[PDB]
Write an enzyme that holds these catalytic residues in place. Structure first.
Site, PDB file in Angstrom:
ATOM      1  N   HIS A   1     -76.793 -17.048 -62.037  1.00 31.06           N
ATOM      2  CA  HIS A   1     -76.735 -16.588 -60.649  1.00 31.06           C
ATOM      3  C   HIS A   1     -77.968 -15.765 -60.322  1.00 31.06           C
ATOM      4  CE1 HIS A   1     -72.393 -17.306 -61.796  1.00 31.06           C
ATOM      5  NE2 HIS A   1     -72.559 -18.118 -60.770  1.00 31.06           N
TER       6      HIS A   1
ATOM      7  N   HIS B   1     -80.115  -5.910 -61.417  1.00 23.89           N
ATOM      8  CA  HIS B   1     -80.553  -7.246 -61.149  1.00 23.89           C
ATOM      9  C   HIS B   1     -81.066  -7.376 -59.765  1.00 23.89           C
ATOM     10  CE1 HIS B   1     -76.537  -6.967 -59.704  1.00 23.89           C
ATOM     11  NE2 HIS B   1     -76.951  -7.794 -58.764  1.00 23.89           N
TER      12      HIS B   1
ATOM     13  N   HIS C   1     -81.726  -9.993 -56.187  1.00 23.61           N
ATOM     14  CA  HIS C   1     -81.446 -11.133 -55.314  1.00 23.61           C
ATOM     15  C   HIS C   1     -82.715 -11.407 -54.543  1.00 23.61           C
ATOM     16  CE1 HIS C   1     -77.058 -10.747 -55.991  1.00 23.61           C
ATOM     17  NE2 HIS C   1     -77.402  -9.481 -56.183  1.00 23.61           N
TER      18      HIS C   1
ATOM     19  N   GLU D   1     -79.852  -8.900 -49.502  1.00 26.09           N
ATOM     20  CA  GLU D   1     -78.404  -8.989 -49.149  1.00 26.09           C
ATOM     21  C   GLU D   1     -78.136  -8.073 -47.969  1.00 26.09           C
ATOM     22  OE1 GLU D   1     -76.342  -8.897 -53.144  1.00 26.09           O
ATOM     23  OE2 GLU D   1     -76.241 -11.001 -52.537  1.00 26.09           O
TER      24      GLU D   1
ATOM     25  N   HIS E   1     -80.540  -4.200 -57.312  1.00 28.27           N
ATOM     26  CA  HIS E   1     -79.295  -3.480 -57.484  1.00 28.27           C
ATOM     27  C   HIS E   1     -79.219  -2.821 -58.841  1.00 28.27           C
ATOM     28  CE1 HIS E   1     -77.247  -6.230 -54.333  1.00 28.27           C
ATOM     29  NE2 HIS E   1     -78.023  -5.307 -53.803  1.00 28.27           N
TER      30      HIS E   1
ATOM     31  N   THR F   1     -71.268  -7.934 -54.537  1.00 26.08           N
ATOM     32  CA  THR F   1     -71.805  -8.990 -53.638  1.00 26.08           C
ATOM     33  C   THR F   1     -71.675 -10.372 -54.229  1.00 26.08           C
ATOM     34  OG1 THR F   1     -74.091  -8.761 -54.353  1.00 26.08           O
ATOM     35  CG2 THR F   1     -73.355  -7.379 -52.455  1.00 26.08           C
TER      36      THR F   1
END
Length: 257
Positions: free
Chosen positions: A61, A91, A93, A103, A116, A195
């Protein structure tokens, strides 16, 4: 199973994880003009000098940098928080293009990526217990924009070719997460959720006002990762962000005017 594709992406997650349509889902849009300045909010306390990073993992992911959270080595306190929260992982995104990837949004603006730093409340003993509590987690969210390089990111970018595909891990010791922090710790805060599935409503979100800048080359390297396992068909790990969710009965508070 869940992902970010046409057939398994965020609009589908509610079928396996009905809390997707819950009352305190994340991320959200941060409307800067309607956030409430709260002078009772304390300055954040970020104590990362004794952090012990262990490993970096492609989990299919995103990628996660994991830390030793068996002692109070890297902790977040203060701000809106009561108690001590231990860093377990960070991590990112990110997007396929520099104009998307975050996000959270700020007045509907998307950033190129979002970091995050995930922490859990030590009163609950472990991360697994903490995610079952309304005050279990504190996630420090930091926006990334494209501009000058962030030298403190480069060690991460370096190791990504060792974890190109789902399930690959690599030793990743002696990484200093202080090198990923902007100058200011001014923040917005609100109660929300993970999330990603399981989307548990256990997070006090602390989203920093000031983005960090990373280079075009640095983000481009995130985009060469793969969602797939080795020997499966190649799908680039891009656009692994959940869009903003309804604020519902929540007010975002700001530590700054």
């Amino acid at each position: 199973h869940w992902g970010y594709g046409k057939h398994n992406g965020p609009e589908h997650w509610h079928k396996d994880f009905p809390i997707a349509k819950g009352e305190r889902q994340s991320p959200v849009d941060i409307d800067t003009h309607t956030a409430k300045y709260d002078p009772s909010l304390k300055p954040l306390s970020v104590s990362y000098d004794q952090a012990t990073s262990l490993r970096i993992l492609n989990n299919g992911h995103a990628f996660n940098v994991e830390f030793d959270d068996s002692q109070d080595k890297a902790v977040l306190k203060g701000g809106p928080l009561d108690g001590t929260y231990r860093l377990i992982q960070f991590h990112f995104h990110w997007g396929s293009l520099d104009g998307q990837g975050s996000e959270h949004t700020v007045d509907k603006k998307k950033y190129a990526a979002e970091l995050h730093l995930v922490h859990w409340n030590t009163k609950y003993g472990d991360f697994g217990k903490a995610v079952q509590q309304p005050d279990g987690l504190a996630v420090l969210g930091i926006f990334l924009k494209v501009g000058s390089a962030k030298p403190g990111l480069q060690k991460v970018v370096d190791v990504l070719d060792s974890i190109k595909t789902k399930g690959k891990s690599a030793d990743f010791t002696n990484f200093d997460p202080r090198g990923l922090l902007p100058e200011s710790l001014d923040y917005w805060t609100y109660p929300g959720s993970l999330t990603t599935p399981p989307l548990l409503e256990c997070v006090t979100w602390i989203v920093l006002k000031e983005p960090i800048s990373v280079s075009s080359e640095q983000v481009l390297k995130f985009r060469k990762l793969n969602f797939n396992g080795e020997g499966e068909p190649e799908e680039l790990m891009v656009d692994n962000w959940r869009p903003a969710q309804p604020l519902k009965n929540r007010q975002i508070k700001a530590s700054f005017k």
